[PDB]
Amino acid sequence: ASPPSPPRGIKVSEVTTRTARLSWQSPYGNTVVTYIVRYWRDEQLHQLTFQVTSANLKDLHPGTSYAVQILAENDVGASIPSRLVQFRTIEE
Secondary structure: OOOOOOOEEEEEEEEOOOOEEEEEEOOOOOOOOEEEEEEEEOOOEEEEEEOOOEEEEOOOOOOOEEEEEEEEEOOOOEOOOOOOEEEEOOOO
């Protein structure tokens, strides 16, 4: 066994004033893998976990730039992070 490879194909599907919806694909095979979503304002650091390859980030600041990483995790440990994805919430 070994840590999983990174999540793949990360897309920011929708963005609103206070939410951002994320989509991705499971990592290349290395067992059960879950995910760690780290996001922050790009100008506190937030971290949430998910079992499915989608996440709706909530109660974000309007008209704000965000960075987001996603990591895969199994019972060995976490993958190397995704590349950083940039998105921007809609102004109020």
